[PDB]
Swiss-Prot record, chain A:
Family: Belongs to the ATPase alpha/beta chains family.
Protein name: ATP synthase F(1) complex subunit alpha, mitochondrial
Function noted in UniProt: Subunit alpha, of the mitochondrial membrane ATP synthase complex (F(1)F(0) ATP synthase or Complex V) that produces ATP from ADP in the presence of a proton gradient across the membrane which is generated by electron transport complexes of the respiratory chain. ATP synthase complex consist of a soluble F(1) head domain - the catalytic core - and a membrane F(1) domain - the membrane proton channel. These two domains are linked by a central stalk rotating inside the F(1) region and a stationary peripheral stalk.
Further comment found in the protein's record: The siderophore enterobactin (Ent) produced by enteric bacteria binds Fe(3+) and helps bacteria scavenge iron ions from the environment. As a consequence, the mammalian siderocalin LCN2 plays an important role in defense against bacterial infections by sequestering iron bound to microbial siderophores. LCN2 can also bind iron bound to endogenous or nutrient-derived iron chelators and plays an important role in cellular iron homeostasis.
Omega-N-methylarginine carried by residues: 156
PROSITE patterns registered for this protein in UniProt: ATPASE_ALPHA_BETA
From Swiss-Prot, chain B:
Biological function: Subunit d, of the mitochondrial membrane ATP synthase complex (F(1)F(0) ATP synthase or Complex V) that produces ATP from ADP in the presence of a proton gradient across the membrane which is generated by electron transport complexes of the respiratory chain. ATP synthase complex consist of a soluble F(1) head domain - the catalytic core - and a membrane F(1) domain - the membrane proton channel. These two domains are linked by a central stalk rotating inside the F(1) region and a stationary peripheral stalk.
Section of the entire sequence shown: 5 to 55 of 161
Source species: Bos taurus (Bovine)
UniProt name for this protein: ATP synthase peripheral stalk subunit d, mitochondrial
Modification N6-acetyllysine, positions: 28, 44
Subcellular location: Mitochondrion; Mitochondrion inner membrane
Gene: ATP5PD
Lineage: Eukaryota, Metazoa, Chordata, Craniata, Vertebrata
Oligomeric and partner information: Component of the ATP synthase complex composed at least of ATP5F1A/subunit alpha, ATP5F1B/subunit beta, ATP5MC1/subunit c (homooctomer), MT-ATP6/subunit a, MT-ATP8/subunit 8, ATP5ME/subunit e, ATP5MF/subunit f, ATP5MG/subunit g, ATP5MK/subunit k, ATP5MJ/subunit j, ATP5F1C/subunit gamma, ATP5F1D/subunit delta, ATP5F1E/subunit epsilon, ATP5PF/subunit F6, ATP5PB/subunit b, ATP5PD/subunit d, ATP5PO/subunit OSCP.
Similarity-based family: Belongs to the ATPase d subunit family.
Swiss-Prot record, chain D:
Molecular-function GO terms, alphabetical: angiostatin binding; ATPase binding; ATPase inhibitor activity; calmodulin binding; identical protein binding; protein homodimerization activity; structural molecule activity
Taxonomic lineage of the native organism: Eukaryota, Metazoa, Chordata, Craniata, Vertebrata
Effect of residue 32 to A: Strongly impairs F(1)F(o)-ATP synthase-binding
Effect of residue 34 to A: Impairs F(1)F(o)-ATP synthase-binding
Species this protein is from: Bos taurus
Protein's name according to its UniProt entry: ATPase inhibitor, mitochondrial
Keyword Mitochondrion: yes
UniProt subcellular location: Mitochondrion
Region ranges (N-terminal inhibitory region): 1-20
Keyword Transit peptide: yes
From Swiss-Prot, chain E:
Modified residues annotated as N6-acetyllysine in this record: 66, 103, 140, 201, 206, 368, 422, 427, 464
Glycan attachment positions: 48
Modified residues (Phosphothreonine): 254
Residues where Phosphoserine is found: 357, 375
Membrane topology term: Peripheral membrane protein
Compartments, record wording: Mitochondrion inner membrane
GO molecular function terms listed in the Swiss-Prot or TrEMBL record: ATP binding; ATP hydrolysis activity; proton-transporting ATP synthase activity, rotational mechanism
Name of the protein described by the UniProt record: ATP synthase F(1) complex catalytic subunit beta, mitochondrial
Disulfide bonds: none
Assigned keywords, A-Z: Acetylation, ATP synthesis, ATP-binding, CF(1), Glycoprotein, Hydrogen ion transport, Ion transport, Magnesium, Membrane, Metal-binding, Mitochondrion, Mitochondrion inner membrane, Nucleotide-binding, Phosphoprotein, Transit peptide, Translocase, Transport
Organism: Bos taurus (Bovine)
Name of the gene this protein is made from: ATP5F1B
Length: 498, 51, 53, 47, 469
């Protein structure tokens, strides 16, 4: 009964207004690119619309015709059609109304669930914040992976790069980072809440559905936006999805809040851009990518800033995901993005199969912020851990004397300490506890095949018996002398009792 | 409801005759698994929005 | 023992050098293929750019 | 195509890491010995 | 004159003039923009059309938009009033501090000094860095290069040089950030404000900054180098004084030139580079020179794409530099910082008649021992260290001590290492390496030499290592 009533509610409010609008005739349509004739006042990279309600962008302004790219399917556009200019640069909805919604590259709800109630729109192609608004990266972005929070820390406003081969665990790191923010978003203070945006570029719809259900299971869609431009979406959409998501995050960082955006991958945005550019007839470049392929990314990753307290104080972290071919980091797009981003997180298949998961290659992984953007407890402990692994990696290729034998023992203990599962990120204090136990010669007695058992049991024991100590470490944010003495006695007791 | 008497383990391991360690270790492991399970389960069953 | 050890080291080094020679032959063939492929790829890129103006 | 000095450690294959470790272990041992001798000399030269 | 946009393709705008055309390299101002968009003429296409590269985003341009012809190339404010400020390619300030109030505007395009103006005098510039001072010593008025891939220490090294040379340098200084991260631009601004070279209160600033960071369209990155170069040129000539000029990186100038060449109708060259790579780079690097009227000490950071030193861009840049310090990743993995490669770095003044026979002989001995070490590393991969001639082990030990002793802690890398920065006078570096070669330290362990200043600090570190043994 009420189904038809709510159906009518939609008609009751319509768009009566018909206006006198400028137009153009489609001289030629093919491969997703139209050549409109007319539109004498259409702007550059403006949004136009076709006779069937299908949108497009006027990318080329040639003297005789306008080269338009169609944001959708192309079979429905004929020759001699009509293109009406909307008189507005391409823009997307923004706001907290988008949280928990799966949307396409243009901000249209994709999961049903009604429409988006956004009250504001933002232009995708906006300039990055200047030099003055920013401020050095201060807070830590808690990722939940021990090896990332300890050895290659990420701040808020940094632009890490997750680069590896196919199926080494990049999207897994992204999902762990997204899921971990649940503890902060559930709390009270707004200075720690981090809203997450996941841009899925070129991934088949099944993968994005799996990801969305995984986030829902971990109850992580309360604060996550998913901008999906999947493989079957015309190239002009996969080219624009990163910019739409970055605008949705620019809103947060401009309104004093903190956001995290994860482009996944950028190596597929590059391919979509290449297809667009080749079908507009623009001359190719190296590996057929257009000349403006560095710009494409540099203008996009430069929007992940850390505003100073005069401009709200908000921040927007970025975690672009690149995909190399057989570890050839020396390729074109990988090198561009490596020279664009701050840090890197190298995942290697040789480490993935050797049992080290996440495969993070701590030897090559870097983070310019480093010291800054790390909690004091983690700063204290991960430093000694970093030195110990650095020494271990030198003498590792073989396998006598007591000193070097114990050095290898400690290195191996720490190595098996850094392993982890999927979608089970750890609180920072728990990571500190585990790493402290491992680095203070305690595990040197145990076998290295049992270190996982220890780690797990120790976590389960501490999370219940010694919740107070973990709360102390979190609140005070350092391993004070009394906290250190406690940690010492807890570890000494537990080790023997196991 | 729950208030479990604390234990000392290095102390506990001192009181097992060699003929009885094979059951002591198994009991330790079974305790471990059950404690992990209990930690896994939440403090309460979540509410229901009947209205 | 020293006589036998020196004989065995001579034999082992000879075999290792032979294996390195076979591997060098295979890698030289691969290198030549890759060098020609790289020349062709760069040249085709230049040609496509020139004809796409 | 030629070969040049210090190429085994430029490739970084298995032989490169093997050589790096064969060097590092030996020089850690010698550093330990030299540090012991340095401590002995320190003690013997206090007076 | 007034013209009219007739095409917009990417960053390239085609503008049609009904009156007389504007000459190549002139600046045109688009009418109807909230901000200031400046196009620069690059070609005359006939039929009264001129192709141009936009110095800003070409979004919202409409076919038909009127354009004004300024009549001169991009003219930037120059003078002592630009010190302590920040600028765009087109010279407008981006420090949110008000207009730059100068009486002189200088066009960013000028001819290079003629051959009858070249200075031929060279004297070492002591930077306080052991490897640089020993193996590839710099020179006042000479052009320095800092090659290396990504993540090897180019920015840290250049910041360290600004910390040392610029802080205690009487003359002025200029920093042109070309196509680099904006985070780094802000970090440098604040570090300079803290140190005091940029004074926001008085008129005692000693540094002028120009920024063309990597969010800008290719037109602006290809010209911010010329803007910084113009500021430096003015300080060289009119002020008649010493100048420093730091650029980071001068590979983004080339790359930005390459991002528009295909759209200007040029066939590409060897590896997706513009046909005019060498000429375009020469017409710029030839104005960064020490004429007889002034003296510019130019330090340039040069990205080497994928560590490939044979790429056309760094390969061409090599010929325009007096000194080079090729930072190497294979040495940065080992933890030796700065990762300057001792065998792949060179200087012009590195002759016995300019530095001295002691300095020269020490440098050549170090280089020879390192090359012999490289030769031995191939054998150690099969034999093992235990099987080397008792003389070879001596070479390997000396080589490792020398390899570690070239590492040094910077005052700007306190955050990473946590150590304290050291400045090593040239005589102390020469003494240290001469002693290490002569064998006066063949008993101290290798790690004693790692990340220390003068040699006595290595002795003290070894003493501490022994005491807590």
């Amino acid at each position: 009964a009420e189904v038809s009533s709510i159906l009518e509610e939609r008609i009751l409010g319509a768009d009566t207004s018909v206006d006198l609008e400028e137009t153009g005739r489609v001289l030629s349509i093919g491969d997703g690119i139209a050549r409109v004739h007319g539109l004498r006042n259409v702007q550059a990279e403006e949004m136009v619309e076709f006779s069937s309600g299908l949108k497009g962008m006027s990318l080329n302004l040639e003297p005789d015709n306008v080269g338009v790219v169609v944001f959708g399917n192309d079979k429905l556009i004929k020759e001699g059609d009509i293109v009406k200019r909307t008189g507005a640069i391409v823009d997307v909805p923004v706001g907290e109304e988008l949280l928990g919604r799966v949307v396409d590259a243009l901000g249209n709800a994709i999961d049903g669930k009604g429409p988006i109630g956004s009250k504001a729109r933002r232009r995708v192609g906006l300039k990055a914040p200047g030099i003055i608004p920013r401020i050095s990266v201060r807070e830590p972005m808690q990722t939940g992976i021990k090896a990332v929070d300890s050895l290659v820390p990420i701040g808020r406003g940094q632009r890490e790069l997750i680069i590896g081969d196919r199926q080494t665990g990049k999207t897994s790191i992204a999902i762990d980072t997204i899921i971990n923010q649940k503890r902060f978003n559930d709390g009270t203070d707004e200075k720690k809440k981090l809203y997450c945006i996941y841009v899925a570029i070129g991934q088949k719809r099944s993968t994005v559905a799996q990801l969305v259900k995984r986030l829902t299971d971990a109850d992580a869609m309360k604060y996550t936006i998913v901008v999906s431009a999947t493989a079957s979406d015309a190239a002009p959409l996969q080219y624009l999805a990163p910019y739409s998501g970055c605008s949705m995050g620019e809103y947060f960082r401009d309104n004093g809040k903190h956001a995290l955006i994860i482009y996944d991958d950028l190596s597929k945005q590059a391919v979509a851009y290449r297809q667009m550019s080749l079908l507009l007839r623009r001359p190719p470049g190296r590996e057929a990518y257009p000349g403006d392929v560095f710009y494409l990314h540099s203008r996009l990753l430069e929007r992940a800033a850390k505003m100073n307290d005069a401009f709200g104080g908000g921040s927007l972290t970025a975690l672009p995901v690149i995909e190399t071919q057989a570890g050839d980091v020396s390729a074109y797009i990988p090198t561009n993005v490596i020279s664009i981003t701050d840090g890197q997180i190298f995942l290697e298949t040789e480490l993935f199969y050797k049992g080290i998961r996440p495969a993070i290659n701590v030897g090559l992984s870097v983070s310019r912020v480093g010291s800054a953007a790390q909690t004091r407890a983690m700063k204290q402990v991960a430093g000694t851990m970093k030195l110990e692994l650095a020494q271990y990696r030198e003498v590792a290729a073989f396998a006598l004397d007591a000193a070097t034998q114990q050095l290898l023992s400690r290195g191996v203990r720490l190595t098996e300490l850094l392993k982890q599962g999927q979608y089970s990120p750890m609180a920072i204090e728990e990571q500190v506890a585990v790493i402290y136990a491992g680095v203070r010669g305690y595990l040197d007695k145990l076998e290295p095949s049992k270190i996982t058992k220890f780690e797990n049991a120790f976590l389960s024991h501490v999370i219940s018996q010694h919740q107070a100590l973990l709360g102390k470490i979190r609140t005070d944010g350092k391993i004070s002398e009394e906290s250190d003495a406690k940690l010492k006695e807890i570890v000494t007791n537990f080790l023997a009792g196991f | 409801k729950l208030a479990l008497k604390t234990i000392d383990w290095v102390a506990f391991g001192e009181i097992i005759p060699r003929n009885q360690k094979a059951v002591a270790n198994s009991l330790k492991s079974w305790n471990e698994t059950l404690t992990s399970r209990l930690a896994t389960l939440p403090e309460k069953p979540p509410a229901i929005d009947w209205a | 023992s020293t006589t036998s050890e020196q004989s065995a080291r001579m034999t082992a080094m000879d075999n290792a050098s032979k294996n390195a020679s076979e591997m060098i032959d295979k890698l030289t063939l691969t290198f030549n293929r890759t060098r020609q492929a790289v020349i062709t790829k760069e040249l085709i890129e230049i040609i496509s750019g020139a004809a796409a103006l | 195509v030629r070969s040049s000095a210090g190429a085994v450690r430029d490739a970084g294959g298995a032989f490169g890491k093997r050589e790096q470790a064969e060097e590092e272990r030996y020089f850690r041992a010698r550093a330990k010995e030299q540090l012991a001798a340095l401590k002995k000399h320190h003690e013997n030269e206090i007076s | 004159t007034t013209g009219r946009i007739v095409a917009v393709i990417g960053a390239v705008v085609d503008v049609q003039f009904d009156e007389g055309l504007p000459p190549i390299l002139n600046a045109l101002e688009v009418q109807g923009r909230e901000t200031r968009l400046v196009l620069e003429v690059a070609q005359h296409l006939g039929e009264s059309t001129v192709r141009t590269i936009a110095m800003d985003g070409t979004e919202g341009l409409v076919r038909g938009q009127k354009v004004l012809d300024s009549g001169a190339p991009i003219r930037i404010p120059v003078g002592p009033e630009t010190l302590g400020r920040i600028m765009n390619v087109i010279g407008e300030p981006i420090d949110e501090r008000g207009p730059i109030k100068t009486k002189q505007f200088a066009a960013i395009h000028a001819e290079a000094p003629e051959f009858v103006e070249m200075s031929v005098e060279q004297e070492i510039l002591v930077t306080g860095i052991k490897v640089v001072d020993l193996l590839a010593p710099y020179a006042k008025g000479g052009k320095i290069g800092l090659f290396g891939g990504a993540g090897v220490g180019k920015t840290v090294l250049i910041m360290e040089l600004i910390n040392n040379v610029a802080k205690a340098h009487g003359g002025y200084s200029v920093f042109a950030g070309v196509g680099e991260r904006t985070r780094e631009g802000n970090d440098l601004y604040h570090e300079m404000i803290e140190s005091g070279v940029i004074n926001l209160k008085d008129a005692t600033s000693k540094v002028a900054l120009v920024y063309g960071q990597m969010n800008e369209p290719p037109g602006a990155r290809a010209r911010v180098a010329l803007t910084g170069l113009t500021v430096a040129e003015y300080f060289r000539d009119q002020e008649g004084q010493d100048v420093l000029l730091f650029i980071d990186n001068i590979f983004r100038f080339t790359q930005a030139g390459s991002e528009v060449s295909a759209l200007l109708g040029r066939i590409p060259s060897a590896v997706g580079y513009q046909p005019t790579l060498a000429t375009d780079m020469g017409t710029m690097q030839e104005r960064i020179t020490t004429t007889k009227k002034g003296s510019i000490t130019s330090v340039q950071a040069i990205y080497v794409p994928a560590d490939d030193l044979t790429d056309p861009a760094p390969a061409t840049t090599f010929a325009h530099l007096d000194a080079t310090t090729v930072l190497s990743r294979a040495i940065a993995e080992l933890g030796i910082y700065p990762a300057v490669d001792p065998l792949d770095s060179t200087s012009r003044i590195m002759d016995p008649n300019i530095v001295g026979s002691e300095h020269y002989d020490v440098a050549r001995g170090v280089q020879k021992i390192l090359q012999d070490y490289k030769s031995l590393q191939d054998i150690i991969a099969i034999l093992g260290m235990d099987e080397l001639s008792e003389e070879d082990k001596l070479t390997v030990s000396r080589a490792r001590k020398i390899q570690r002793f070239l590492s040094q802690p910077f005052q700007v890398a306190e955050v990473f290492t946590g150590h304290l920065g050291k400045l090593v006078p040239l005589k102390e570096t020469i003494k240290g390496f001469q002693q290490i070669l002569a064998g006066e330290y063949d008993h101290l362990p290798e790690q004693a030499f790692y990340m220390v200043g003068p040699i006595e600090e290595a002795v003290a570190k070894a003493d501490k290592l022994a005491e807590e043994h």
